[PDB]
Amino acid sequence: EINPKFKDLRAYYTKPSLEFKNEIGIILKKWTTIRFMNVVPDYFIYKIALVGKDDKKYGEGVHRNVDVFVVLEENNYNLEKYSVGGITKSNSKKVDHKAGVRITKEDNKGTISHDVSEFKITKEQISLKELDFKLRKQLIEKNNLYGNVGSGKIVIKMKNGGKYTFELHKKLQENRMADVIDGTNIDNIEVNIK
Numbered sequence: 001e002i003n004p005k006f007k008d009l010r011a012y013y014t015k016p017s018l019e020f021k022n023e024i025g026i027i028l029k030k031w032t033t034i035r036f037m038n039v040v041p042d043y044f045i046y047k048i049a050l051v052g053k054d055d056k057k058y059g060e061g062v063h064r065n066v067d068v069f070v071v072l073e074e075n076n077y078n079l080e081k082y083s084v085g086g087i088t089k090s091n092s093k094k095v096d097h098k099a100g101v102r103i104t105k106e107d108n109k110g111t112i113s114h115d116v117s118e119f120k121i122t123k124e125q126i127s128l129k130e131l132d133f134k135l136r137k138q139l140i141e142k143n144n145l146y147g148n149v150g151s152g153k154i155v156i157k158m159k160n161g162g163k164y165t166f167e168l169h170k171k172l173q174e175n176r177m178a179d180v181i182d183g184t185n186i187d188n189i190e191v192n193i194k
């Protein structure tokens with residue numbers, strides 16, 4: 001029912017997450033190996049690692065109209081509240097979009113399940129981090145991802161034919177946690193677990 005071969009992935013993708021909307025980001029002078037966006041939604045300062053394309057995108061100073069999708073992590077910088085990527089532009093208008101999910105699953109025994117789902121997007125711009133994190137956590141919850149089976153792929157398919165693939169046998173590559181896409185152009189989501 002739960003295989004220890006996948007324990008790290010199942011623990012990573014069942015971690016709680018936090019969403020910060022219509023917020024402000026402060027980036028200061030580089031002090032270590034990378035640069036951080038500081039966000040202060042409550043009594044804490046959160047350090048959001050500027051990885052991948054976020055490094056060039058954000059100069060030092062103040063950035064308004066910022067959403068962040070947060071998954072707090074251990075780290076080697078001695079930081080209490082740290083997460084990687086998931087910074088996006090705050091909605092410029094109402095967003096309430098759902099995309100169809102089709103899920104196919106094959107265990108080691110040959111049993112082939114077929115689920116469907118609907119995925120609610122409430123952001124005009126959304127990080128792959130958020131999509132990857134929320135879709136995996138769901139698959140674990142409802143389809144036993146990282147229980148009996150722990151590989152395969154998620155494919156996000158777009159109105160224009162483009163796509164974004166998450167391979168299920170490892171974490172999303174950290175650089176990709178900074179990648180962002182138009183939520184309301186997500187057409188459907190194809191999950192294949194094998």
Ligand SMILES: CC(=O)N[C@@H]1[C@@H](O[C@@H]2O[C@@H](C)[C@@H](O)[C@@H](O)[C@@H]2O)[C@H](O[C@@H]2O[C@H](CO)[C@H](O)[C@H](O[C@]3(C(=O)O)C[C@H](O)[C@@H](NC(C)=O)[C@H]([C@H](O)[C@H](O)CO)O3)[C@H]2O)[C@@H](CO)O[C@@H]1O
Pocket residue numbers: 128162163164165166167173174175176179
């Ligand atoms: C070492 C490392 O972390 N390197 C990553 C790249 O990932 C490695 O190379 C891959 C080819 C694969 O072996 C993977 O296991 C390695 O970790 C990474 O390259 C992306 O990897 C993912 C799979 O993890 C996809 O294969 C992706 O291709 C696509 C996609 O399907 O998602 C193709 C697609 O056409 C394209 N979409 C559009 C609209 O242009 C997307 C899109 O560029 C990305 O999804 C954006 O995140 O890519 C491989 O590109 C690479 C991607 O940025 O980053 C590190 O270099």
Ligand SMILES: O=S(=O)(O)CCN1CCN(CCS(=O)(=O)O)CC1
Pocket residue numbers: 016017018042043044072
């Ligand atoms: O489980 S998680 O690690 O994801 C949640 C961590 N978390 C988010 C909300 N706060 C501060 C609230 S406040 O006191 O500053 O208002 C601490 C508890």
Ligand SMILES: [Cl-]
Pocket residue numbers: 072073074
């Ligand atoms: Cl961790």
Ligand SMILES: [Cl-]
Pocket residue numbers: 158181182185
């Ligand atoms: Cl797009």
